[PDB]
């Protein structure tokens, strides 16, 4: 499971 | 409608959306939520960075996998209370229906009518 920009306090963006 | 638009201000969202659109130009940022009257399982993650060439049908498949949905179970997407064509690309959907915060919003339900 890759997550992008997880630092932002939003759980990050699921990279597909 | 969407809780993401309530839990986050417009100005914050718009800035992040521009940032993402400029840094990941080949990708589309999509916020995904369950419709209220929907009786299917919820998605832990709501934000998805998807290739602009990804199709509605491919996205149906991934979301089905991600909420542990059986084939006997139904799933519909709604873009502005309208089921998008499965042949459509996420990029085309963004170009046409991205909100002013530069995100594409999509609801999903077990029913063919949003609620």
Residue numbers in the entry:
A (entry chain B): 95 to 110
B (entry chain A): 2 to 116
Give the exact sentences the study uses for this entry.
Proteins of the LC3 or GABARAP families are conjugated via their C-terminal glycine residue to phosphatidylethanolamine-containing lipids. This process is catalyzed by an intricate enzymatic cascade in which ATG7 functions as an activating E1 enzyme using ATP to form a thioester with LC3/GABARAP and transferring them to an E2 enzyme, ATG3, via a trans-thioesterification reaction. ATG3 performs the lipidation of LC3/GABARAP in conjunction with an E3-like enzyme complex of isopeptide-linked ATG5-ATG12. Proteins containing LIR motifs are recruited to LC3/GABARAP through hydrophobic interactions.
